[PDB]
Design a protein around this ligand. Structure first.
Ligand SMILES: [Mg+2]
Ligand SMILES: [Mg+2]
Ligand SMILES: [Mg+2]
Ligand SMILES: [Mg+2]
Ligand SMILES: [Mg+2]
Ligand SMILES: [Mg+2]
Ligand SMILES: [Mg+2]
Ligand SMILES: [Mg+2]
Ligand SMILES: [Mg+2]
Ligand SMILES: [Zn+2]
Lengths: 175, 138, 36, 123
RNA sequence: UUGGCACCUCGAUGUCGGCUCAUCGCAUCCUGGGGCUGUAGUCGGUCCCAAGGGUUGGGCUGUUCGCCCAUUAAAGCGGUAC
RNA sequence: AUACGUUAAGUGGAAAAGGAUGUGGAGUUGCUUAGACAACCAGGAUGUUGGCUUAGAAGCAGCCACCAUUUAAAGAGUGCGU
RNA sequence: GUCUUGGAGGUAGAGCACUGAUUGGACUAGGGGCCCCUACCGGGUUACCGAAUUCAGUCAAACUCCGAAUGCCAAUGACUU
């Protein structure tokens, strides 16, 4: 069918304030988000009514009319409750640990490795072999999790290193 | 290897190759066939190569019909020699093909399998082709 | 894997365009190929 | 949509004879479980359990031109057809009890069908 | 490269090897970064980006070629009137 | 300058076999509110792995045209496989 | 020079009537090979070679039953030079 036509509701706590130049922001029970959008692309909001008005049908218009809606849904969802993603740490003795606000890890490397986050993204190590990112912006926590995972990608012959919270990895064999 | 059993002359002009084909532009010995689109020569061995490939791909249920046949010979001088003093020696055999000709015809298998076989044979010929099937109205 | 003639191999390969180039991605990494 | 009318009027003759009928939840149904249920039919009521499963709710809303104005809450919902062509479910009610209380496919949304205007509390 | 043609030069455009001095291309020999692997690891194979710098001493032959000895991270291929 | 179309590559301002959900026209044509294609919930067997050979080959050692019934479909196996 | 009219000639193209080349069917005594038994008869085949012959289908600078446009040679009139 078409994603640029699904209407977005607005929970009571969500107080979105439309502003000119498509510079709309949002306020909710977990903080603040804001993004400016394409100028000609039309957006108007009524209570629980997100009118993604599309101009004349073109290529770029057919693209933005969906992308803007998707991002708006993501934004309201985040400011409602935010997102997160776990990180598996398989290892054979690898293990992580918190420190102050930053995060350190001890993979088989010859020295500790550390990662520090920015604001709005809290890292948490519930178990010393499991990590969970957490924050409001979906793409931002995605980026942080990607940075972390990029330290030690999983290994084919034996699942080893960081790993997204549940995903199939290929598996060859040596002899 | 196709070649005549005896010829009148052994050396012979090359001649021009303009204009559409005289005749033989309609498949009538089968169901499908490839039709040329631009003039060229077809070497004695290109034909048999395409034929062997095509007949191997098929499950031998169908049959083939090599329409054209190399008759004109063409010469070539020895290597590293100046120009003049006698035409060269006959070398091989070709067959001119003006656009509109129908080179191969197949009959005895399904449509799509013949289409696949003909496509596979096309990649061995120096020209561009087109898949055409039997005119039902004649 | 790079070549001027890219086309699917398995049944679940796919064809896309990135930065004006033609690409093919699939699960089996051996199928991954890019034109030019 | 040629034979849609055909079968939606054909089911009239098969629905008008009996008094009671019955419905079954559609999904979460193993076809090993479906064939076990079919063989259970073959020993109890051969094919009388309507295993016709190629129908859109229009089937029942156009079979409802006479009576049975209840599929509106079952049509747009999991549906596995059946009927009780023989006398009132003094037997097939407990049959269905033992065949869907914990068996091949769940009971779930099942409410049976119309004997009279009623839907539930059959015996 | 081996050739084909004979457009300039016959009131003169002096050959091949070596020495001194170099410079450019990249279709990369080394070092830098990667994909796939019939990549366990250490070695590899193949392909992609990359021209910054580096890229040997002898024996035998007039020799370029070539073979051999001993090393090196490596002992690159070509143009500039070979 | 006027009017109507096309291209997003600096094509314009260099080349082919071949490859491609680029894009504009012209068509041909199937399915479809009796509801299409997605996506999500379901399932995908019975003398039946049947007369099978290599340990089950119980899905593909590979011979049966490894068929016919229970229906709603199940190919007694699409592929992954094992 | 142009308009009108009359000629000679076998190119482009076409075609298979002649001469060569050539594809696929029909049909073959003559059987070649298998054989039945063939020592020899006679017979299925002949995988015919089935030769022609026939049915369709493609080619030609030194093939032609056909055959232009142009060009060439004249005429008697006209209009220009
Ligand atoms: Mg003809
Ligand atoms: Mg290839
Ligand atoms: Mg001088
Ligand atoms: Mg390069
Ligand atoms: Mg020199
Ligand atoms: Mg030179
Ligand atoms: Mg350009
Ligand atoms: Mg001619
Ligand atoms: Mg002639
Ligand atoms: Zn693939």
């Amino acid at each position: 069918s078409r994603v640029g036509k699904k209407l977005l509701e607005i929970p009571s706590d969500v107080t979105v304030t439309l502003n000119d130049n498509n510079t709309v922001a949002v306020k909710g029970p977990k903080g603040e988000l804001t993004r400016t959008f394409h100028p000609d692309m039309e957006i108007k909001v009524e209570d629980n009514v997100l009118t993604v008005a599309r101009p004349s049908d073109q290529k770029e218009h057919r693209a933005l009319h969906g992308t803007t809606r998707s991002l708006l849904g993501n934004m309201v969802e985040g400011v409602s409750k935010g997102f997160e993603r776990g990180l598996e740490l398989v290892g054979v003795g690898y293990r992580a640990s918190k420190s102050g606000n930053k995060l350190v890890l001890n993979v088989g490397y010859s020295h500790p490795v550390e990662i520090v986050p920015e604001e709005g993204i809290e890292i948490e190590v519930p178990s010393q072999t499991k990590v969970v990112v957490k924050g409001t912006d979906k793409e931002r926590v995605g980026a942080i999790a990607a940075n972390i995972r990029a330290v030690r990608s999983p290994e084919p012959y034996k699942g080893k290193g960081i790993r997204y919270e549940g995903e199939v990895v290929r598996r060859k064999e040596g002899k | 290897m196709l070649l005549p059993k005896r010829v009148k002359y052994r050396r012979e002009h090359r001649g021009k190759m303009r204009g559409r084909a005289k005749g033989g532009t309609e498949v009538h010995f089968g169901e499908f066939g490839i039709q040329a689109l631009e003039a060229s020569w077809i070497t004695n061995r290109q034909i048999e190569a395409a034929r062997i490939a095509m007949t191997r791909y098929m499950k031998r249920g169908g049959k083939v019909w090599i329409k054209i046949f190399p008759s004109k010979p063409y010469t070539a001088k020895p290597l590293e020699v100046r120009m003049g003093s006698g035409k060269g020696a006959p070398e091989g055999w070709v067959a001119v093909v003006k656009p509109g000709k129908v080179l191969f015809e197949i009959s005895g298998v399904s449509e799509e399998v013949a289409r696949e076989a003909l496509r596979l044979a096309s990649h061995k010929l120096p020209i561009k082709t087109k898949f055409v099937k039997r005119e039902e109205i004649g | 894997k790079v070549r001027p003639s890219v086309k699917p191999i398995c049944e679940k390969c796919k064809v896309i365009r990135r930065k004006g180039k033609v690409m093919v991605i699939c699960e089996n990494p051996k199928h991954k190929q890019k034109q030019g | 949509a040629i034979e849609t009318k055909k079968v939606v009027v054909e089911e009239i003759a098969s629905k008008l004879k009996e008094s009671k009928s019955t419905i079954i939840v559609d999904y979460r149904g193993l076809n090993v479980s479906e064939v076990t249920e079919l063989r259970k039919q073959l020993r109890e009521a051969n094919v009388e359990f309507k295993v016709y499963k190629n129908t859109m709710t229009r089937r029942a809303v156009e079979q409802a031109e006479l009576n049975g104005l209840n599929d509106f809450l079952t049509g747009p919902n999991a549906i596995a057809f059946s009927t009780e062509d023989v006398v009132a479910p003094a037997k097939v009610l407990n049959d269905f009890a033992k065949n869907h209380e914990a068996l091949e496919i769940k009971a779930g949304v099942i409410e049976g069908k119309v004997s009279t205007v009623e839907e539930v509390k059959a015996l």
